[PDB]
Amino acid sequence: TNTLQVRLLSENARMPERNHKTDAGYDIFSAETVVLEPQEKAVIKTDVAVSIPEGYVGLLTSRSGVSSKTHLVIETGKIDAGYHGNLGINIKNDAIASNGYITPGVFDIKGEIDLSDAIRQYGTYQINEGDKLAQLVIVPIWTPELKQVEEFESV
Amino acid sequence: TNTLQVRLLSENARMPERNHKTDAGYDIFSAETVVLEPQEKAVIKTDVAVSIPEGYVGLLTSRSGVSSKTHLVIETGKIDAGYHGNLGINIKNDAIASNGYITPGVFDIKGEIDLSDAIRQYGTYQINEGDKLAQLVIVPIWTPELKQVEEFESV
Amino acid sequence: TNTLQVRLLSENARMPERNHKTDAGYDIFSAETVVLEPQEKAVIKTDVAVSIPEGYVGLLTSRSGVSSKTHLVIETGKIDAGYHGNLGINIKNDAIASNGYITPGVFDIKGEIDLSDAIRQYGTYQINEGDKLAQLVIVPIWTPELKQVEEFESV
Amino acid sequence: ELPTHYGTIIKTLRKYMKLTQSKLSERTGFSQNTISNHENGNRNIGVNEIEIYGKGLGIPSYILHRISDEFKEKGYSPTLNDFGKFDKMYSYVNKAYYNDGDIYYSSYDLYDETIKLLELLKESKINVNDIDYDYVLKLYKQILS
Amino acid sequence: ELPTHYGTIIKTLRKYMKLTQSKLSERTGFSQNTISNHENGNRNIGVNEIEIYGKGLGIPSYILHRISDEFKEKGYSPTLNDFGKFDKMYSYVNKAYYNDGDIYYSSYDLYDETIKLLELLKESKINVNDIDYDYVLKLYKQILS
Amino acid sequence: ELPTHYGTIIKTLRKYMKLTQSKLSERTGFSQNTISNHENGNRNIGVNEIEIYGKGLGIPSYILHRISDEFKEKGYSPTLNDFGKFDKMYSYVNKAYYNDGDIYYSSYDLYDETIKLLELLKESKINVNDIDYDYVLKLYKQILS
Ligand SMILES: [Mg+2]
Ligand code: NI
Ligand code: NI
Ligand code: NI
């Protein structure tokens, strides 16, 4: 039917966005504000849910500007058909803490630095509610029955 | 024909597992016991082989519970149609070693710590034979002939 | 029509290569020489452009020999249909710098060490023009219209 | 050839699902003679045959192998013995995994997790029949932190 | 139900694209009465309806939401006011993203980036109509380093 | 337009595969006149034409470019000269890559790896014809550690 059903789970949720009908993916937005010091990990809530149809998988994955200009690393999540809960973005700040070096500055998702409320390790990121953090790409799948064999054989 | 042929290469091999006909992937099991100190890398044997049919690629990839609650990082392997050898999981422990800190404790694939036979750097993982480490997702592919052009042109 | 259009953007560009008609991907070559000390990042130019047809996405991704025998980490780029610029490989050297340890040696893409012109941190890689760094895998995609719903409902 | 205790596993399961040897054959496509021999320990059963029994029983095949692993570690299967409780709890657990982010992204193994939830209840003399989804969900999140 | 200022956003946009209420309906499939009520502030508009207006106007839907976000931060939309300039600049910006590696791999948000380019021009009293693609491209790379 | 030494590469290869200029045309779809001019150095050959010769010769096209790269580094191609040995060895190497995990996950370039295996044999005066798959496999793993 060529439509994807979407649930907005809160007032902080943003409907996913697309530029161009031909684009591979839908940009996905953080619903919360998160501070990650170096080597810190989190799963970041979007307050969005989707219904991937049978025969597909959803790929929740990174964007070139974010991953090449920051140390934020996103591990591609595989969304099953029928997972209907809150979509989460699986993230690590893979900067390394440098000896001492402490600072009131925090980096953002564009690689820029501003001034924060506290003293932390140099290299800390702060993700904001509304940051355009990831994308969703949906691809078809093959899901066969398994057969054990002693030797492989022609189809 | 909608069946996938599988070879069990040893008595430590486990047949891949699936919950639900609609699930994207087949869970894949370690056939060996491996200790990885921080920043250590290995390709971990499964003692399983598969025959991916022509027109597809197999994706040997991570699971959300493992990658979000441990420092074990899996690099998605691309399995060609016609690769018939032992499937390997490409893994790094991306914890960083903290100064001294040494310990007899080792972390497992659930993020928990137990007591080991030796003294090692704090942050060391131990993977056990039978650990549910990765999944296999199979997707169709386009494999065209290449044409060089001076300028792009409409299809 | 089963052909992929390719533009060679310079004399350092190499036409992508494939062994076997059934192989998942096309090997992709660096067009430049780049030194990456530990934790250093770059987007490495190939001087190649492609025209991915509508309904697909191109995946610019790693090779098993490179990622399992070096610390070079490649983040899979998603190439949109209609992106016609220079293809770039998104790379980090994820070795950690060890205290002092400095050296005139640099590691290559095979994990081997040779002698360089300068003194740098132990763990530095040098990528050469013509290195077989990545592959390109092209998969079909679903690109539906979005519908907001209060509750999910059967298709 | 798989171990012979698979015969007991299939018989006891067939009985639990309220199916006759004839009705199972109707869904599996085995001969009634083959089924009886399978359960009696006559014929050894193969891995591919276990996949077919699972489909006919309406149980995920991997669960039969997990039961068998219990036979090998001890000499019997507590899970098989109290399969009714496992059924009830496994259903809550699946509903949680596919509907709650805290479970979906943290879970390691739904079967082992079902068993730890039952074992926790048993240790506090609580009956599975006298509790609901929301109680399990709160507990399940506790064991995943 | 979306805010009522969406009515103004759709009217002003409809007018900019040189379309009549009847002609928009012909492309959207709404009733002329529905469109008028939408613009007048009678009917509230839904998110799904905004997706349809976008398609009919030949404007990416997300842009309407960004304009609305300007209404909420200030009390009006500079972008909506100078939409002709935004159109011109957004087109250069898109041509750059899909044809130049330095833009494609570094860009964070094409809309915000279009606006920073306009704001830079305004601060140096330069008219968008008197410059070309190559001037914008050089500047755009500057703001992405 | 590609270098003219490609003409020699295609002639010598055509001859090695025991094919006539007429029979190659039958598989490639070039004119016999075109083929002769290609080999003689009359017509320059394009990259797209090299893809077609490869298919007709039953050789992966990239190999022709690698041979040409040998021409450019030295002034001749050792590989082309001893192409029969390269053929034999490249076949072992491919069988190893697609059937053994140690090769599949460690290999960097099958062509360069085929050549290092031949060069090692030559340095110890060993004849490629007098050894088997298992000897090569052991050696190949040695050069990948
Ligand atoms: Mg790291
Ligand atoms: Ni059940
Ligand atoms: Ni526009
Ligand atoms: Ni050959």
Numbering used by the authors:
A (entry chain G), B (entry chain G), C (entry chain G): 2 to 156
D (entry chain H), E (entry chain H), F (entry chain H): 9 to 153
Describing publication, verbatim:
The Staphylococcus aureus pathogenicity islands (SaPIs) are the prototypical members of the phage-inducible chromosomal island (PICI) family of mobile genetic elements. Stl is a DNA-binding protein that binds to the intergenic promoter region between stl and str (the SaPI transcription rightward regulator), preventing transcription of the str and downstream genes, thus maintaining integration of the island in the host chromosome. The remarkable ability of the SaPIbov1 Stl to target unrelated but functionally similar antirepressor proteins relies on the modularity of this repressor. In this way, SaPIbov1 Stl presents three domains: one corresponds to an HTH N-terminal domain required to recognize and bind the divergent stl-str region present in the SaPI genome; a second (middle) domain responsible for interacting with the trimeric Duts, while the C-terminal part of the protein recognizes the dimeric Duts.
Comparison of the BovI-StlN-ter Dutϕ11 complex with the structures of both proteins alone showed that complex formation induces modest changes, mainly in Stl, indicating that their structural conformations in solution are competent for interaction. Further examination of the Stl–Dutϕ11 interaction showed that BovI-Stl inserts the helix α8 and the α8–α9 connecting loop (Lα8α9) into the Dutϕ11 active centre, mimicking the interactions mediated by the substrate with catalytic residues on the conserved motifs of trimeric Duts. Consequently, this short region of Stl occupies the Dut active centre and contacts residues from all the conserved catalytic motifs with the exception of motif V, which remains disordered in the Dutϕ11–Stl complex. In addition, the R74 and D77 residues from Stl helix α5, which connect the HTH and middle domain, are also involved in Stl–Dut recognition, forming a secondary, albeit more modest, area of interaction. In this area of interaction, residues R74 and D77 form salt bridges with Dutϕ11 residues preceding the Dut motif I, E18 and R15, respectively.
